[PDB]
């Protein structure tokens, strides 16, 4: 059914810094020359980025999984179609619906079906000498395909695929959000070519995909692509071939910030409201310049940490066990009037107990109770067989 | 991106209280709304108070629910003659004992076991090891207030007036510059019109 192809070598990840990214307009509306605050899901002004060394022929074989955690912010600069798709699912099996995104030079196919996933799925392509091109023939990434619900096919919109050799001269962007049974995928392409890994670009994404899906997800994996290598039987090589690529990893958290529109309706300069006091005083004042003096801001309040209770202990000392113990009554014929009031009337006797059937109503939180005073606990003395409890 | 045509709602009879308008009073089929999401489903129909604001119900505890917005349509016509097998309607069924007060717009499809006792399924059947899926088994001659009912709810979520889903039959030519009211794509207002570039 499945073939396990793992490597014992593991390398810890590396971290870097992220400049001003993760920004979008809160609403589809348009505005000019008017400043406006905003409180929704975004990415702060300064943070860190995590990209893995997905180069293995020095070499490093790392194909791990990433938890969902309510949306993951992505960005990639692939040139040889390294990142093919993203498989979603807590268990990644045929019992959960997954997403299959495949992009080619003819059509963009987005399928959401329950494809069977092996232990180590990977897509491989070959290169025919006669045709002098690359095609796909090893479609072993999925074993079974059932419960087909969604299937969308469209032409490539923001992908050119014209340059034969592009040395990291592109910027595709993806935004993932799973709220209200939806998985929105925002698209953004801006040409960038600089020296550093991360330039100082700043441009909000534009909505293009609003596909809904309702399922609890806490784990997913990013797919990949492989190029077949012609090896002799006696070569005894590693058997794995891959290119050069990387992918940023981040997560989402709701905060509040500030935006400033321009005459063209695009945020030109924005201050981070919760970065520092100099920008904190601009949260209240609607200007990006402040004169000397004193400016008040949101008050400093310490929230309490310890929240515990101290209820009475003795009060009235075992309402039912002082004369009747746990349970012991006199003859059936004598219905003696015995009521205990102004007492604890706790229900510690029926918590553990043994078998019994009770009065079969327990209106408020059955077997919890112990929250009302009640008038009295008058317990008449009588014995019955109990089999005719319905009577 | 269609014509909606809500005038068909006034046809037929039965249904139930709308109990969700939540915008303002005047005319029905003028505004273009934002998004029309139809989520028709079939319940026992014993009580529809769960679909009402507040009053969480047994089915809505693990199924469709509106958290606090609603504003939709909860049209639900009674029908027992249709889609009713003579030997019990075993097709319809429901899932039970799924936590308590789940997220409203979040559906799940899985059985496993709730593990409400002490021994889980561990991939096999057992006591208190039932997959949460119980056949409704509607009977053609089982009461009137308990026979299956057809109910469809609508999301609405009115936030963007100029949208694409509206089909009023009224059509008028565009005005260049006249101090008149405008109702383009469900957006109402008054003023004067002026052409410019942006």
């Amino acid at each position: 059914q499945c073939v396990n192809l793992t490597t014992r070598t593991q390398l810890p990840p590396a971290y870097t810094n992220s400049f001003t990214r993760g920004v979008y307009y809160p609403d589809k509306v348009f505005r000019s020359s008017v400043l406006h605050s905003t409180q929704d899901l975004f990415l702060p002004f300064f943070s860190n980025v995590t990209w893995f060394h997905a180069i293995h022929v020095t070499k490093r074989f790392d194909n791990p999984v990433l938890p969902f955690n309510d949306g993951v912010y992505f960005a990639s600069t692939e040139k040889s179609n390294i990142i093919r798709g993203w498989i979603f699912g807590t268990t990644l099996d045929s019992k959960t619906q997954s997403l299959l995104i495949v992009n080619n030079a003819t059509n963009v196919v987005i399928k959401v079906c329950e494809f069977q996933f092996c232990n180590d799925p990977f897509l491989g392509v070959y290169y025919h000498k006669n045709n002098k091109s690359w095609m796909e023939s090893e479609f072993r990434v999925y074993s079974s395909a059932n419960n087909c619900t969604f299937e969308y096919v469209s032409q490539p919109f923001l992908m050119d695929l014209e340059g034969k050799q592009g040395n990291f001269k592109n910027l595709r962007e993806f935004v993932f959000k799973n709220i209200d049974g939806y998985f929105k995928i925002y698209s953004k392409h801006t040409p960038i070519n600089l020296v550093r890994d991360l330039p100082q670009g700043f441009s909000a994404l534009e909505p293009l995909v609003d596909l809904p899906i309702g399922i609890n997800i806490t784990r997913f994996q990013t797919l990949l692509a492989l190029h077949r290598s012609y090896l002799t039987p006696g070569d005894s090589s590693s058997g794995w071939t891959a290119g050069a690529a990387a992918y940023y990893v981040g997560y989402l958290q709701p905060r509040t910030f500030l935006l400033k529109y321009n005459e063209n309706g695009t945020i030109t300069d924005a201050v981070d409201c919760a970065l520092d006091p100099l920008s904190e005083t601009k949260c209240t004042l609607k200007s990006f310049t402040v004169e000397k003096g004193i400016y008040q801001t949101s008050n400093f309040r310490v929230q309490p940490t310890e929240s515990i209770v101290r209820f009475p202990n003795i009060t009235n000392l075992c309402p039912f066990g002082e004369v009747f113990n746990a349970t012991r009554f006199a003859s059936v014929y004598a219905w003696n009037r015995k009521r205990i009031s102004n007492c604890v009337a706790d229900y510690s006797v029926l918590y553990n107990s043994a078998s019994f059937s009770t009065f079969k109503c327990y209106g408020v939180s059955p077997t919890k109770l112990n929250d009302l005073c009640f008038t009295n606990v008058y317990a008449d003395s009588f014995v019955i067989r109990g089999d005719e409890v319905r009577q | 991106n269609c014509v909606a045509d809500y005038s068909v709602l006034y046809n037929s009879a039965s249904f139930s209280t709308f109990k969700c308008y939540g915008v303002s009073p005047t005319k029905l089929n003028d505004l273009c709304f934002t998004n029309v999401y139809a989520d028709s489903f079939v319940i026992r129909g014993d009580e529809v108070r769960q679909i009402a604001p507040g009053q969480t119900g047994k089915i809505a505890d693990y199924n469709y629910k509106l958290p606090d917005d609603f504003t939709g349509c909860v049209i639900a016509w009674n029908s027992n003659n249709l889609d009713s097998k003579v030997g019990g309607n075993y097709n319809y069924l429901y899932r039970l004992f799924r936590k308590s007060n789940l997220k409203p717009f979040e559906r799940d499809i899985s059985t496993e076991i709730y593990q409400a006792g002490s021994t889980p399924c561990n991939g096999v059947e057992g006591f208190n090891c039932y997959f949460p899926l119980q056949s409704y088994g509607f009977q053609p001659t089982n009461g009137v207030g308990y026979q299956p009912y057809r109910v469809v709810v609508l999301s609405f979520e009115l936030l963007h007036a100029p949208a694409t889903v509206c089909g009023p039959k009224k059509s008028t030519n565009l005005v260049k510059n006249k101090c008149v009211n405008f109702n383009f794509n469900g957006l109402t207002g008054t003023g004067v019109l002026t052409e410019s570039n942006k």
Partner: nanobody
Amino acid sequence: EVQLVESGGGLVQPGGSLRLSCAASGGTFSSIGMGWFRQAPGKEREFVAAISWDGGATAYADSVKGRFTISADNSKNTAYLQMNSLKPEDTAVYYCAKEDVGKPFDWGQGTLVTVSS
């Protein structure tokens, strides 16, 4: 301790049909794990089936498919079962436990059921 009563068992010709009764007097009225169990001679006790008290859920083992259907009565607080295609190895003793709030598999005494000619 809980009281469980089982009756109606005995010798039956092969491929017969038995209607045994398990009258559960009370039972905390919070049942979640009503099910029957068998103990074949020299064979360890194994799961047979189960019936939910809050629903019509009736799970069955692989070996009792079709030939075994169990049912209860919320009004009567009983547990009935019907058998078909009795085959010699089915000769064993059965039980009907009561699993409830705290109540473990409230075990009883069962009844001997004989499948032979």
